[PDB]
């Protein structure tokens, strides 16, 4: 139709939070995505939930790379001077290959990218869903930490339900243990280690159903047999281009859409408009609709409407390395065994005593090791071949204000790193918190356009220079110190800062606070755009604090709160 109760722009996990809540409460809901259905028959599901990926996990890095399209690529200035004399040769560094001439290459988030597919980035994400501690967390209630705490605990608990967050899916991993147990011993009881909270449900010792948008809301059109009184339509391959403001900037009056298959343009009317296009694309849509300021920022002319839009952006510093498990940890795996003879020979034996108390490990472990060692005498490691991967974290705390992940991501190894047994390899990712600063901006060209003919995004970003930078380097050191407890670096995966924005944890582009002016912000704690009765924004762009933990669960929690406001303030149309 051209009229709905609610329209939601974006079918990521945040848009699906809105759909779950509002479709369930009886609203006539339409959802538009610029991308298309491409996870199988479960619409918007995790693409890593095939048998083939989970039997060939390192190949999934390719699926991720294939759907990360860089936000802003500066003009290239590499000198190619070995062209043949006959080949056409540039006289200048002209604009080539979709580069953005607005972009300062030295003030960029070059790693920033976007994903345009039904289910958004939740079709590929790592599914880490920690809660934020107060230090990282936006206030929802002022002057009452207890009420604030109580609200966040309620919302986070609901969001963990939606995502099926759990901390138990990797408990029988030898490697997971080996890592966690060593680290927790070494920190004087002052840094707790636990499993990474993961939005996932294990189905078997070798298959994990990773959560996604589809987990939150199945994205099937309604009414259907299972939900005969619900009303939901998903429209893929539709670019949402502009929301139309009234004169007072108190209401949105229509949404302009562009059907990318037919080419046709329409306008859609709703009672409520929710924008969940991502931290970048929410901002782009708003700026193309007259919010904030189009073009290169100019202080001698501040925007009247949403002046903080696209300012105070945050992205986390990310450090990474891999390690190769120490000899001492590997010997510890098999500490409870008596081993006689040499592998492969007639006399070789590996035994342990069931249920014994001098033993460091329980029977489940010792049986796995014994059986692996006796059945695979060609193999020099005591770790079973199908041992699940480590999933360890010590969460952000005041004394170490960074998030940590000590685990395995799907990885593309150089041929020489494929030299090292995967059982030995552990990935380390430490994520820093970035102070929000007005000078750090996402803005949109008034002349350059992207692949969808929308104003080209441009970053003007540097990590702040005092606390943020001090912490980022302390965080690198902490990774170096901590990782050395488990093993030395893997050659080729030495400690390093990753390309700015490769972490894809951008926030603050349309930030939340209590007062538009006082808190330099765009949406209130109901995620409602100041001044507007009927426009709401969802996503990490809402988060106004410096945070190091993975933001999505927090964004979801804010969206639940926003949905409560809509339920309190808009009546669904009769079915």
Ligand X SMILES: *Cc1cc2c(cc1C)nc1c(=O)[nH]c(=O)nc-1n2C[C@H](O)[C@H](O)[C@H](O)COP(=O)(O)OP(=O)(O)OC[C@H]1O[C@@H](n2cnc3c(N)ncnc32)[C@H](O)[C@@H]1O
Could you tell me the two tokens for 79?
A: 């000198």
Specify whether 361 is catalytic: no
214 touching a second copy, by CB under 8 A:
no
Task: Name the nearest CA neighbour of 324 among 476, 498, 495, 483.
Answer: 483
What is the nearest approach in angstroms of ligand X to the Cβ of residue 23? Answer: 16
Query: Of the ranges 20-28, 124-132, 263-271, 305-313, which one interacts with ligand X (CB under 6 A)?
Result: 124-132
Is the CB of residue 530 less than 8 Å from the CB of residue 500? no
**Selected binder of ligand X within 551, 558, 560, 563 (CB under 6 A):** 551
**Selected binder of a second copy within 24, 25, 26, 63 (CB under 8 A):** 63
**Cα 47 from chain centre:** 15
Task: Name the nearest CA neighbour of 560 among 14, 59, 4.
Answer: 14
Q: Within 10 Å of residue 383's Cβ, how many Cβ atoms?
A: 23
74-103: contacts with a second copy (CB under 8 A): 74, 76-92, 94-98, 100-103
474 is in an annotated binding site: no
Specify whether 505 is catalytic: yes
- Residue located via tokens 């592998």: 343
**Selected binder of a second copy within 60, 217, 232, 402 (CB under 8 A):** 60
**Selected binder of a second copy within 416, 438, 517, 571 (CB under 8 A):** 416
245-274: contacts with ligand X (CB under 6 A): none
13 touching ligand X, by CB under 6 A:
yes
126 touching a second copy, by CB under 8 A:
no
Q: State the DSSP H helix or E strand holding residue 355, giving kind and residue range, or none if neither.
A: none
Is the CB of residue 472 less than 8 Å from the CB of residue 317? yes
- Residue located via tokens 């079918």: 11
Could you tell me the two tokens for 497?
A: 């800062």
What is the nearest approach in angstroms of a second copy to the Cβ of residue 63? Answer: 5
343 touching a second copy, by CB under 8 A:
no
Alpha helices in 340-401 (DSSP H): 363-375
Give the x/- contact pattern for a second copy in 539-568, rule: CB under 8 A: ------------------------------
Q: What are phi and psi of 372, to 5 degrees?
A: -60, -45
Secondary structure (DSSP) of 468-482:
HHHHHHHHHHHHHHH
**Cα 345 from chain centre:** 50
308-327: contacts with a second copy (CB under 8 A): 317, 323-327
Give the x/- contact pattern for a second copy in 261-300, rule: CB under 8 A: x-x-------------------------------------
**In the complex with a second copy, which residue's Cβ is closer, 197 or 507?**
507
121 is in an annotated binding site: yes
Three-class secondary structure of residue 154 per DSSP: helix
Is the CB of residue 272 less than 8 Å from the CB of residue 488? no
Annotated catalytic residues are 505, 550
- Could you list the residues that contact ligand X (CB under 6 A)? 9-15, 32-35, 64, 115-117, 120-122, 124-129, 239-240, 276-278, 281, 285, 504, 539-540, 550-552, 555
């Amino acid at each position: 139709d051209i009229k709905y109760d609610v329209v939601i722009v974006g079918s990521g996990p945040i848009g699906c939070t809105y759909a779950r809540e509002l479709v369930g409460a009886g609203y006539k809901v339409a959802m538009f995505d610029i991308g298309e259905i491409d996870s199988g028959l479960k619409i918007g599901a995790h693409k890593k939930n095939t048998v083939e990926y989970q039997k060939n996990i390192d190949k999934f890095v390719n699926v991720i790379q294939g759907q990360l399209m860089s936000v802003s690529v500066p003009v290239n200035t590499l000198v190619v001077d070995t062209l043949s004399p006959t080949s056409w040769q540039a006289s200048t560094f002209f604009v080539r290959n979709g580069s953005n001439p607005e972009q300062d290459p030295l003030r960029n988030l070059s790693g920033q990218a976007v994903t345009r597919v039904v289910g958004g980035m939740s079709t590929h994400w790592t599914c880490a869903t920690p809660r934020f501690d107060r230090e990282q967390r936006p206030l929802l209630v002022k002057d009452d930490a207890d009420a604030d705490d109580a609200e966040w605990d309620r919302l986070y608990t609901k969001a963990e339900s939606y995502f099926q967050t759990g901390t138990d899916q990797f408990k029988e991993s030898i490697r997971h243990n080996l890592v966690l147990n060593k680290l927790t011993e070494e920190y004087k009881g002052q840094r707790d280690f636990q499993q990474i909270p993961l939005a996932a449900t294990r189905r078997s010792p070798t298959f994990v159903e990773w959560s996604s948008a589809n987990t939150v809301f199945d994205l099937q059109n309604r009414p259907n047999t299972d939900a005969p009184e619900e009303r939901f339509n998903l429209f893929p391959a539709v670019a949402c281009e502009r929301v139309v403001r009234n004169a007072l900037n108190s209401e949105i009056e229509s949404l302009h859409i562009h059907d990318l298959i037919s080419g046709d343009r329409f306008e859609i009317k709703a009672d409520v408009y929710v924008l969940t296009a991502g931290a970048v694309h929410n901002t782009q849509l708003l700026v193309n609709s007259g919010f904030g300021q189009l073009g290169r920022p100019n202080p001698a002319n501040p925007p009247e409407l949403l002046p903080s839009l696209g300012s105070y952006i945050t992205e986390q510093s990310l450090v990474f390395c891999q390690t190769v498990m120490s000899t001492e940890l590997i010997d510890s795996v098999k500490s409870d065994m008596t081993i006689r003879g040499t592998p492969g020979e007639l006399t070789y034996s590996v035994t342990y005593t069931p249920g014994a108390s001098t033993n460091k490990h329980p029977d489940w472990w010792n049986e796995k090791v014994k059986n692996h060692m006796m059945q695979h005498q060609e193999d020099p490691l005591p770790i079973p071949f199908e041992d699940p991967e480590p999933q360890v974290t010590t969460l952000f705390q005041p004394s170490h204000p960074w998030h940590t992940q000590i685990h395995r991501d799907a990885n593309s190894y150089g041929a020489v790193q494929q030299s090292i047994d995967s059982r030995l390899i552990v990935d380390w990712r430490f994520f820093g918190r970035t102070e929000p600063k007005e000078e750090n901006k996402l803005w949109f060209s008034d002349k350059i356009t992207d692949a969808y003919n929308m104003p080209q995004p441009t970053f003007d970003f540097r990590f702040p220079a005092g606390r943020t930078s001090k912490e980022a380097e302390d965080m690198m050191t902490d990774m170096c110190v901590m990782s050395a407890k488990i093993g030395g670096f893997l050659p080729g995966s030495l400690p390093q800062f990753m390309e700015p924005g490769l972490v894809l944890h951008l926030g603050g582009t349309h930030r939340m606070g209590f007062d538009e002016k006082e808190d330099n912000c765009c949406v209130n704690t109901d995620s409602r755009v100041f001044g507007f009765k009927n426009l709401f924004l969802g996503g990490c762009g809402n988060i106004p604090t410096a945070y190091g933990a993975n933001p999505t669960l927090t964004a979801m929690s804010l969206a639940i709160k926003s949905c409560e406001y809509i339920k309190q303030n808009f009546t669904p149309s009769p079915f």
